[PDB]
Amino acid sequence: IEEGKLVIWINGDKGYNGLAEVGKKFEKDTGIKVTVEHPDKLEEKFPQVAATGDGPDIIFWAHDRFGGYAQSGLLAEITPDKAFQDKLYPFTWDAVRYNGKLIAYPIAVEALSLIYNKDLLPNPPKTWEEIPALDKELKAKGKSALMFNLQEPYFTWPLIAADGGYAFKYENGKYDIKDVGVDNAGAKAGLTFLVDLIKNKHMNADTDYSIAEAAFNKGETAMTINGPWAWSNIDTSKVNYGVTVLPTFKGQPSKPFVGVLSAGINAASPNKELAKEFLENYLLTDEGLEAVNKDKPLGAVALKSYEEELAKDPRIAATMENAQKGEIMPNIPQMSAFWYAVRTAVINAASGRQTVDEALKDAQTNSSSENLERPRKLPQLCTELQTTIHDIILECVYCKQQLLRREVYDFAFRDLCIVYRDGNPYAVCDKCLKFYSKISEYRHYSYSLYGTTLEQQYNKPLSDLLIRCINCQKPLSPEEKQRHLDKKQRFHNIRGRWTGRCMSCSRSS
Amino acid sequence: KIEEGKLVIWINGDKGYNGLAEVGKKFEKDTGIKVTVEHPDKLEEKFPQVAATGDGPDIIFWAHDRFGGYAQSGLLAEITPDKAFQDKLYPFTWDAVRYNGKLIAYPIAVEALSLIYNKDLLPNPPKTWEEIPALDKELKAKGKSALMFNLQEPYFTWPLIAADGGYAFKYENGKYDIKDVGVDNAGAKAGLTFLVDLIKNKHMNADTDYSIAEAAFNKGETAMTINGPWAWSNIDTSKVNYGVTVLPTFKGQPSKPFVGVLSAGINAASPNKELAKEFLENLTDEGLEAVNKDKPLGAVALKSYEEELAKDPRIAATMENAQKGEIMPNIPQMSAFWYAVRTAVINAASGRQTVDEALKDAQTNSSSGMFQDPQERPRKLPQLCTELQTTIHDIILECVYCKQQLLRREVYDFAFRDLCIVYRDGNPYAVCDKCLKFYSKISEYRHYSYSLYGTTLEQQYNKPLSDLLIRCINCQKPLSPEEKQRHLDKKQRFHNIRGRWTCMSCSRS
Amino acid sequence: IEEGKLVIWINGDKGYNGLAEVGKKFEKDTGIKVTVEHPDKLEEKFPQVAATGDGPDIIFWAHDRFGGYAQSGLLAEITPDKAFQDKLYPFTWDAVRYNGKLIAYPIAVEALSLIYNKDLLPNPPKTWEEIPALDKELKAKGKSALMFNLQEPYFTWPLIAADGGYAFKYENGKYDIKDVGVDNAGAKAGLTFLVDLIKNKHMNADTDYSIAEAAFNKGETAMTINGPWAWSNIDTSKVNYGVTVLPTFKGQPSKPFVGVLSAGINAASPNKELAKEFLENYLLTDEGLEAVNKDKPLGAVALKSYEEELAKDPRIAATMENAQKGEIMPNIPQMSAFWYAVRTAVINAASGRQTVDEALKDAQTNSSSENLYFQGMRPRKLPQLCTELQTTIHDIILECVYCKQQLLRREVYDFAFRDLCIVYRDGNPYAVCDKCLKFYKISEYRHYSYSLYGTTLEQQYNKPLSDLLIRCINCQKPLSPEEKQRHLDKKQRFHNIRGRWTGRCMSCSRSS
Amino acid sequence: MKIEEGKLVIWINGDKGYNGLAEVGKKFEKDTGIKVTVEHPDKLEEKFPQVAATGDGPDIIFWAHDRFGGYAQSGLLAEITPDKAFQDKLYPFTWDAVRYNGKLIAYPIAVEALSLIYNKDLLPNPPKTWEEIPALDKELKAKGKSALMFNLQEPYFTWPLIAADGGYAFKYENGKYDIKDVGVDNAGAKAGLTFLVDLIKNKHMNADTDYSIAEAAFNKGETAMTINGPWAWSNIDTSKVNYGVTVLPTFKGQPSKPFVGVLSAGINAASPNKELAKEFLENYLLTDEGLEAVNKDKPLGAVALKSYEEELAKDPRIAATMENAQKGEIMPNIPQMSAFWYAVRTAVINAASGRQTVDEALKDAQTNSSSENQERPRKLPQLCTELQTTIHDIILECVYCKQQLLRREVYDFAFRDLCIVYRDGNPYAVCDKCLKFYSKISEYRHYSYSLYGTTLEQQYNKPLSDLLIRCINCQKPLSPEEKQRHLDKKQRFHNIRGRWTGRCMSCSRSS
Ligand SMILES: [Zn+2]
Ligand SMILES: [Zn+2]
Ligand SMILES: [Zn+2]
Ligand SMILES: [Zn+2]
Ligand SMILES: [Zn+2]
Ligand SMILES: [Zn+2]
Ligand SMILES: [Zn+2]
């Protein structure tokens, strides 16, 4: 950490050059030189450096990750002047509050909106269902209907959560319920529609913000979904871009996850009070906000000056209209796991292998809890506790009864993994082990592999390798082997039993 | 394997096995085949393990909740009687023995719990559970206990649990949702808390079982007991005026026992499948009455129950409690429910206590690292490589979270950390480095605690607490010996950190 | 009643033409012609005519009012043999079972379901709370979101029973004596949502069955709540009608009352055996039920020939799903008064005099057993009681209702001079004694409170409010003409206390 | 102006110590100048509402808290405004009893609860159950004594047996009583009354016994048990009977639940000297010296004053009175409690007398305790004159559908002279459409008029033989012996459709 020098980290899509302009003011007025940086994977880099203590004095990101930073104790509580707090909008202050207190300054409000090329299409579509027909017409014109980032779930979530997509629910002060709104039938229908667009060649699964932004600038795509920050890039090469309400899906308006752009001061900051004064009386000024808006538009702001200055703009007004229909993203620490699961679900479903139901099912199990410097084996635990395994005291996880000395011995000989529940090591007793072992799933493990991966593993003629039918036990004909590859049906191996389905067994009759 | 020309019947010891044997002696003279009826200990646990071998009984007698799990395992044979025999037996009794749209057992009789009271010791039965604590103190002066019933088995303790709640596995309509189990419900906690408070106030003892409770009531030592119809024969043999009435209400709510249907099942591996089927099919007034004489079978399911058995007031009282209660499900998951509730009731009665914790662990161990590697599923990667006959250098693995194919280095890393393999949907899975790093950073609740009681620490290190030295949790001050005595009196478990087992200043907030 | 011809009554929404064609089969095969007539208010007509002995041989109606008919003796017991009992579904026989004896022949199961036009609205709303927003969007297009019959409580009940609204308690308990759940919070919330839909111009209170049916068929309204009987008329119009589950209210699924079409026999029917054969062996056949379903769909029917035959139809599965969420309607005699009370409350709640809490409050008191003995002639006064019993009042023996003590001769006389009306308990005439009369007279002294609106007050006294004298109850000072007009503008009533009209002055108008 | 000024008039029940209260008042007169007068009026619970309406009556009324709430609704009782120090001097739960509509209405005095008084010499071991008493009476009757004698003419003494197995009364739920949930018809109340009437049928008790007969019997040694409160202990102390206080006997394995009553004092709203009456109650009566004076004449029981109660709690009689109270429940202060007592008293008196069964008497008492049937006009011309309107112009609304009656409907209502309906305190009528529906569902229409045979002969001045009677089922003219069978079996004949009917011997049992 460096004192007398201010280090600011901001996302690349936001205007880092504009923030450098308001920083030069602090360098001449107070004599404190300030550096504005745009690190890649800013949401991932900050927790790693914050644990060591090093990192940026100020960090700019959405408030959802800030709540997890506060639970991690990696950020410092901000202190308003009370009267200065009254100037900013209350709902932005409410979003930067996690379990009380205040974590970050409410800089701006950001929401997704549909951007359409007026020259390519004067009348924007108001429903998702009519978009597939538009792509058929535009591909003949050398254009694409819709191109937007599929790598990040932020852009794809409104379609998923339009019909349902709870993703935790508020219940009179209860939010982070075990129930996750990713397996609801509405979320399945939304992702199925998105996957169907890629399968019907209306969209490409390998599309990121760089490919989609350039296509709209080049005029290749007619529609795209992005936030306020892209407006400046489209302005450089104006394609008659317009901002409209996100399309309705299944009679339901798309619900975007609104994000409050926030600035947080690092907990181990030498210029903590110095950076607090700079954000309070330099960046928050209308002069400072317009400079960052010049490089990349910030959209909706919490400042009272913005309420009359920039709220009149139709693009900003349409962004707020989409925001009111949507719901602000929660600041709970479990949000990072929710983003990772949905990101994994959207990408996997688009590529293949995992169906929409399969990807969302795994997302629910990953988001609710994790199986997971905790000793995995018994000998490691004995050394840290400084007790021999002959003298160690263990308790079964199921019955919470002390293990017998023979039961403790058998656990180490079998080289079993220690199970942790409620932050306490636990083992298994012989009685509970036998009952739960005979529950089911006995020798049920199946090594299912695609034929393409099987060809890479062994090479050689696949026909010479015999894969007898699961029921017929018939040596698979070369045509039956080819059918699995054509229909994308994974071959199954149970112990030493590589098995496939014959044509008669494949179809029910 | 299982012999032919004879029928092997298994029934519990509490049931009247002599009466069933007499029916078989009649079948021996009429059909020419002697049949042997046995009363094995833990027969509900012994039947599944022997049935897979082929050894075991031709007919098994138990409640329908365990039979549904046997049907999914296939250790059960279908029943051929159609509408002619279906109409003779009561319709609702056939509904309980139907699993997956196919009948799985013969509905012999219906059983339900009830309250038995000594009319001479207690002329008028109590109407609510809360009267019993005050009644015990009055009866204690006379030298007699108020109530004694089996606490080792959860079937007897359930009616108090589900009185104000206790949804158990049963949920939804026409189906049961395994995710929602009503064992952590507040009504279930209030019922079990009364039972624990009954034991804490010395009105009941936790070590009491079926034999201890039945002896005291028949010998006149206890005024009330909770038992089914089977105990009436032994109580009638003893010279005690006894009556059967509705179970007491809890918190103004009806006590709900799990209604059970005594059923007859045919082992799938039965050479005499049709022979044993005809013996059960041709369930008659003469056959069921003989078993009822030895030990009452409750309300059977045929004409005999409609006429002679219905006249008994005790049978109607058993049916009255059955109406207040709910019929127990036939789902295979019921075995884990009974095991989890049994362990919860015993630990809450004495030891772990914490009815909230005991029911919480029961919820986790009933709703949804340790298994044998030779059979079942391989524990670690080397065993999986050997069974699949593929070297670790050529094996293909998929991450459980992202399903992306593991890199060869990641496959090597998994084997060296000796990480235990995770199986989802009966398929081997590993973890990729990206998911392993992300999921390890989240959910930080300290590495471990290893909380242990002070009495166990004296046994672990031989030295008493006077010789032992402990440090303060946050002030880092050596604990006074008087502070150690507070922990034992307050039942507080010390915690071990860095091999240092860890004052009054921080003891109270 | 004519002996030979069989008289059958069925409602107009049902298929009367299909029922007549099965009767034409009875006329050709067996030589007995039956006549089916569709009568208006057939639910009310049959109890009237059956007491006189007249009426139809077979009556077709839901099983709710059949229990009250059987208690009155209008219906007759039916025995169809066990083989026919096995042919029909068992739960259908349970609906026609009153006091063990079967009172009618179950025909079909009917339940309400949401009908929506896919062209006007491709995806139906999942929740009731979404309907207000859909109407505003559809209003700009010139269409209305939802229109259904508000005059009959059958269509309004699903919203009432979502968060509560239980007509009677559990089936074993049934009537738990004044356990009617029409004043509960769930019933109050459902009615308040319906009133809010009308007050926010989404729906109209004057809407009836014919108005709502025409709007959906002409494409004017997008959604309507109707049963299977209306499908034929909707199918006649070229409309992409879809049957789906009713929307959710307060996170709770709508609970439609499930009905079963049943056929009962009049007690004074000569051709009892002829009626049984026509119902058992002609109407309740695959061909007989098909004829009635062709004219008007019957929904899920009781015969097991129905299985797979109509169950494959997607509309039928949606009707059963709405039926399984709802509860089967009771067969107790008190159901007739319950339907009248909810109808009165819903009609009152949709219009004025609609505190919603008040409309459901009076419905709770009307559903429970009570009467003020305003009947004509059961004698109402003492002289009429003496005349019917052929005794003089000087010698008549009477008993007090509260204490059951025999009335003194002076107490009997005082009862007649005061012209006190007789009170009937357990069907026995009773009066009152002086001690009980004095005690219960001094129990409540709140006095009469005659509350009238300003417009009705002006009509009654044939004078303007300004010329009429009204005093503020607390101020005891004459009200200003502007103050009296404030009551009219605020729709607040004037009260007559102790023969003096009262109101709230401007100083007392605000909270003080 | 009807009430006197410069003096304080106090009304207290005769069972309480009126003379001891006067001694405290003489101190008030000596210290100041009031000349207070205490009176023990007969039926003061009924007299106070009658006298308070005209403005007259006592300056202070002494009675239990149950009827004081009904006086507050009638406006006869003034509000109580004590300082927080005085409220701390009295016990908290006693203040909660006098709280009606969230405001205090009277000054708590003492707590009262029924107990069992047993002659220790005659009955060394007090019975613990009610079922023991029938066998014990037969033993004492051989000894020339009676087991139990207690007042049966007042429901306060008979209720503890009634509430043991049931006795819902008005029921308690969310801290507010529910008038609709009246529970005197439950099987628990039926069991207690059945045991009570069986004690009278088996000649263990007499149905005509009252307070004076039971008190004199225990004082003279003729009976060995009585159920009475703390006020009677003084007169038993004058008698040589050793006597003692123990818990009430159990019934059906349940403790007898008495109604707890808190003696209280309220000031009439139409009374001067409100501060003078407040001064006497707060600074003279409710003192350690003042409460002792009333206790000497007749024991008040556990007093609300914290200083004196802990001193008199040494008396095992007071602790036994409190033990019975904790098993029971306190009396509701709602005005409907007065109707509850009248219904139970009527049923208990009827059942013990022989008229009506226990099941019949408890049924009518349940309906009497809930809804009810100068002041209200009755008949339309009375309402028209009070409202100064002709019927041609009167506007009336139907009770069921709340719709304004047409003139046609309004004329018909008065031609038929239909007695008016009143709902929610507002005059109402009935419209024709609602009238047809609710008149159709008669549910009975029998109009039975059941009368006994002896009364039938007196009514028509004709013997039963010369009066044709048909059996209800067989429709056979009754034989003269069959008519006597009804009289011997005490079965009343019924006049259905103008025809007297009486069951024949053959139809009495199953055919
Ligand atoms: Zn264990
Ligand atoms: Zn095959
Ligand atoms: Zn991974
Ligand atoms: Zn410390
Ligand atoms: Zn009377
Ligand atoms: Zn009306
Ligand atoms: Zn007869």
Residue of C nearest to A251 (CA): C123
Asked whether the CA dihedral A275, A280, A282, A284 is positive or negative, the reply is positive
Which residue pairs, CB below 8 angstroms and at least 24 apart, start in D97-100?
A: D97/D65, D97/D262, D97/D264, D97/D330, D97/D331, D97/D333, D98/D65, D98/D68, D98/D262, D98/D264, D98/D333, D99/D333, D100/D68, D100/D69, D100/D72, D100/D73, D100/D333
Q: What tokens were used for B274?
A: 């049709």
Identify from A344, A387, A490 which residue to disrupt to test chain B contact, counting B C-beta atoms within 10 A and taking the largest count. A344
CB C385 within 8 A of CB C423: no
C-alpha angle D247-D250-D252 in degrees, rounded to nearest 5: 170
d(C-alpha D18, C-alpha A502), whole Å: 107
d(C-alpha A318, C-alpha A333), whole Å: 30
Q: Which ligand is nearest to the CA of D470?
A: 7
CB C445 within 8 A of CB C402: no
Query: Which are the contacts of B186, defined by CB distance < 8 A and separation ≥ 6?
Result: B164, B165
Looking only at the bridges linking them, the beta strands covering D450-451 and C259-265 are unpaired
Residue range B451-506, CATH number: 3.30.240.40
- Helices A335-351 and A63-71, axial angle in degrees (round to 10): 130
The count of C-alpha atoms lying within 13 angstroms of the C-alpha of C108, restricted to the half-sphere facing its C-beta, is: 29
Distance to chain A for B121, nearest Cα, Å: 38
d(C-alpha D204, C-alpha D196), whole Å: 10
How far does CA D18 lie from the centroid of its chain?
Answer: 23
What distance in angstroms lies between residue C444's CA and the mean position of ligand 4's atoms?
Answer: 69
Contacts of D448 in chain C (CB under 8 A): 426-428
Residue D481 burial class via C-beta count within 10 angstroms: exposed 0-12, middle 13-18, buried 19 and up: exposed
DSSP letter string, A338-380? HHHHHHHHHHHHHHSSS-HHHHHHHHHHHHH-------SSHHH
Length of chain A: 509
Contacts of D131 in chain B (CB under 8 A): 123
Query: Which are the contacts of A176, defined by CB distance < 8 A and separation ≥ 6?
Result: A168, A330, A332, A334
First to last CA, chain C: 71
d(C-alpha D497, C-alpha D501), whole Å: 10
d(C-alpha A255, C-alpha A326), whole Å: 4
d(C-alpha B99, C-alpha B176), whole Å: 12
Radius of gyration of chain A (CA): 28
C324: nearest CB among B91, B173, B323 = B173
Residue A400 falls in which region: left (phi positive, over 0), alpha (psi -120 to 50) or beta: left
What distance in angstroms lies between residue B104's CA and the mean position of ligand 2's atoms?
Answer: 29
d(C-alpha B204, C-alpha B146), whole Å: 9
| Locus of tokens 């004025």 | C352
Residue B441 burial class via C-beta count within 10 angstroms: exposed 0-12, middle 13-18, buried 19 and up: middle
Q: What tokens were used for C301?
A: 């029917």
Asked whether the CA dihedral D212, D213, D216, D219 is positive or negative, the reply is negative
Neighbours of chain B (3+ CB pairs under 8 A): A, C, D
Q: What topology does CATH give the domain C449-508?
A: CRO Repressor (3.30.240)
C-alpha angle C422-C426-C427 in degrees, rounded to nearest 5: 60
At A460, phi and psi to the nearest 5? 65, 170
CB A342 within 8 A of CB A363: yes
CB C228 within 8 A of CB C159: no
How far does CA C277 lie from the centroid of its chain?
Answer: 33
Under 8 Å CB pairs connecting chains A and C tally to 9
How far does CA C141 lie from the centroid of its chain?
Answer: 36
d(C-alpha A146, C-alpha A139), whole Å: 11
- Interface touch B460/A384, C-beta < 8 Å: no
Strands of the sheet containing A491-493, edge to edge, are A447-449, A491-493, A498-499
What distance in angstroms lies between residue C457's CA and the mean position of ligand 6's atoms?
Answer: 21
- List C-alpha distances in Å: A421 to A113, A382, A427, A428, C423: 44, 18, 10, 12, 73
Looking only at the bridges linking them, the beta strands covering B106-111 and B258-266 are antiparallel
- Which resolution, in Å, applies to this structure? 3.2
Give SS3 for C229: helix
E strands of C15-127, at which residues?
Answer: 34-37, 58-62, 105-110, 113-117
Interface of B with C (CB under 8 A): 91, 173-174, 323
- Within 10 Å of residue C340's Cβ, how many Cβ atoms? 21
d(C-alpha C116, C-alpha C244), whole Å: 8
Contacts of B174 in chain C (CB under 8 A): 324
Give SS3 for B331: coil
Give bridge partners of residue B61 from the DSSP assignment: B264
Give bridge partners of residue A427 from the DSSP assignment: A396
How far does CA B502 lie from the centroid of its chain?
Answer: 38
Q: Which helix (H) or strand (E) holds B190?
A: helix B186-200
CA proximity to A223, closest of A129, A140, A131: A131
Residue of C nearest to D371 (CA): C370
How far does CA B501 lie from the centroid of its chain?
Answer: 37
Residue B147 burial class via C-beta count within 10 angstroms: exposed 0-12, middle 13-18, buried 19 and up: buried
At B161, phi and psi to the nearest 5? -70, -45
Contacts of B449 in chain A (CB under 8 A): 423-424
CA proximity to A64, closest of A340, A259, A331, A264: A331
B122: nearest CB among D131, D253, D254 = D253
CB D148 within 8 A of CB D133: yes
- Interface touch C376/D426, C-beta < 8 Å: no
How far does CA C311 lie from the centroid of its chain?
Answer: 30
First to last CA, chain A: 72
CB B366 within 8 A of CB B183: yes
d(C-alpha B256, C-alpha B248), whole Å: 10
Contacts of A251 in chain C (CB under 8 A): 121-125
CB B147 within 8 A of CB B212: no
First to last CA, chain D: 75
Residue of B nearest to D252 (CA): B124
Neighbours of chain A (3+ CB pairs under 8 A): B, C
At A117, phi and psi to the nearest 5? -80, 115
In eight-state DSSP terms, residue A182 is T
Distance to chain B for C297, nearest Cα, Å: 27
Contacts of C395 in chain D (CB under 8 A): 458-461
Identify from B115, B120, B124, B246 which residue to disrupt to test chain D contact, counting D C-beta atoms within 10 A and taking the largest count. B124
Distance to chain A for C154, nearest Cα, Å: 29
Q: What tokens were used for D345?
A: 């008293």
Give SS3 for B274: helix
Residue D100 burial class via C-beta count within 10 angstroms: exposed 0-12, middle 13-18, buried 19 and up: buried
d(C-alpha D494, C-alpha D197), whole Å: 27
Amino acid (one-letter) located at B98: R
Amino acid (one-letter) located at D185: D
d(C-alpha B400, C-alpha C159), whole Å: 46
Amino acid (one-letter) located at D220: K
Please tell me chain D's helix, strand, coil percentages from 3-state DSSP, rounded to the nearest 5: 40, 15, 45
What distance in angstroms lies between residue B141's CA and the mean position of ligand 1's atoms?
Answer: 40
* Alpha helices per DSSP H over A181-271: 185-199, 209-218, 231-236
Q: What tokens were used for A501?
A: 């389905």
- List C-alpha distances in Å: D415 to B83, D377, D380, D381, D393: 68, 17, 10, 11, 16
- List C-alpha distances in Å: C240 to A18, C110, C310, C311: 57, 22, 20, 20
How far does CA C53 lie from the centroid of its chain?
Answer: 26
Interface of A with C (CB under 8 A): 129, 250-252
d(C-alpha C321, C-alpha A205), whole Å: 39
- Interface touch C125/A250, C-beta < 8 Å: no
CA proximity to C58, closest of C227, C259, C229, C270: C270
| Locus of tokens 């003590």 | C405
Amino acid (one-letter) located at D355: R
Under 8 Å CB pairs connecting chains C and D tally to 152
CB B188 within 8 A of CB B359: yes
Chains D and A touching, counted as 3 or more CB pairs less than 8 Å apart: no
Q: Given 3.30.240.40, 3.40.50.300, 3.30.450.40, 3.40.718.10, which CATH number is that of A447-506?
A: 3.30.240.40
Chains A and B touching, counted as 3 or more CB pairs less than 8 Å apart: yes
Give SS3 for B244: strand
Residue of A nearest to B462 (CA): A391
Q: What tokens were used for B189?
A: 């906690």
Under 8 Å CB pairs connecting chains A and B tally to 142
Q: What tokens were used for A500?
A: 């496939």
Pseudo-torsion of CA A172, A178, A179, A180, nearest 10°? 110
Give bridge partners of residue D100 from the DSSP assignment: D103
Amino acid (one-letter) located at C178: K
Q: Which ligand is nearest to the CA of D473?
A: 7
Q: Which ligand is nearest to the CA of B504?
A: 4
Contacts of D253 in chain B (CB under 8 A): 122-126, 131, 135
d(C-alpha A205, C-alpha C240), whole Å: 36
Contacts of B416 in chain A (CB under 8 A): none
What distance in angstroms lies between residue B398's CA and the mean position of ligand 3's atoms?
Answer: 8
Q: Which helix (H) or strand (E) holds D304?
A: none
| Locus of tokens 């409010």 | C465
* Alpha helices per DSSP H over D132-265: 132-142, 155-162, 187-201, 211-219, 233-238
CA proximity to A453, closest of A335, A333, A352, A347: A352
What distance in angstroms lies between residue A455's CA and the mean position of ligand 2's atoms?
Answer: 22
Q: Which ligand is nearest to the CA of D431?
A: 6
Q: Which helix (H) or strand (E) holds B496?
A: strand B496-497
Q: What tokens were used for D143?
A: 């000894």
First to last CA, chain B: 69
- List C-alpha distances in Å: B500 to A384, B472, B476, B480, B496: 9, 11, 11, 16, 5
What distance in angstroms lies between residue B482's CA and the mean position of ligand 4's atoms?
Answer: 14
CB A326 within 8 A of CB A137: no
Residue of C nearest to A164 (CA): C126
Query: Which are the contacts of D326, defined by CB distance < 8 A and separation ≥ 6?
Result: none
Contacts of D400 in chain C (CB under 8 A): 341, 344, 362, 366
Residue of C nearest to A127 (CA): C122
Contacts of A187 in chain C (CB under 8 A): none
d(C-alpha A164, C-alpha A145), whole Å: 25
Distance to chain D for B284, nearest Cα, Å: 34
- Interface touch D372/C396, C-beta < 8 Å: no
d(C-alpha B406, C-alpha B412), whole Å: 10
Asked whether the CA dihedral C289, C291, C292, C297 is positive or negative, the reply is positive
d(C-alpha A241, C-alpha A238), whole Å: 7
Q: What tokens were used for D298?
A: 């007749």
Contacts of B173 in chain C (CB under 8 A): 324
Query: Which are the contacts of A372, defined by CB distance < 8 A and separation ≥ 6?
Result: A420, B439, B440, B443
Q: What topology does CATH give the domain D450-507?
A: CRO Repressor (3.30.240)
Residue of A nearest to B452 (CA): A393
Q: Which helix (H) or strand (E) holds C242?
A: strand C241-244
d(C-alpha A180, C-alpha D98), whole Å: 54
